[PDB]
Amino acid sequence: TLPPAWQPFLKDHRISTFKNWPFLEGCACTPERMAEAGFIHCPTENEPDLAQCFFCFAELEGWEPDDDPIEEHKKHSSGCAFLSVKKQFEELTLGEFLKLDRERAKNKIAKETNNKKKEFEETAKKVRRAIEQLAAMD
């Protein structure tokens, strides 16, 4: 009875996204530990082990059994505030929670911005190339 947009804030929800995750008992990066670090399982045909931080939207693959997810998160997304959250969900005040959800909405946008830029820059290289090639014959 919590809205789905907010479910990823819940460890138990995040764990639940790991269904056919290969690293189970014996491994350091189990679902419990991936979830405690912020990750959601976002697998694809092409990258079966893709994990995404629900908060900062960093995406990491190439997991190995000894990998500590908290350590990998710090290594590859040093700025993610979720890593600073020491309190349990239910111990957060609504003010804190709302402060956190604004930050996530800003992170999401930074991420979409950063993608749109890269796609644009790629498109621009192709057009530039095309016009150079045409100018090259005259």
Binding site: C29, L60, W63, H76
Partner: peptide
């Protein structure tokens, strides 16, 4: 583990 590229 490393970043998508």
């Amino acid at each position: 583990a490393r970043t998508k590229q």
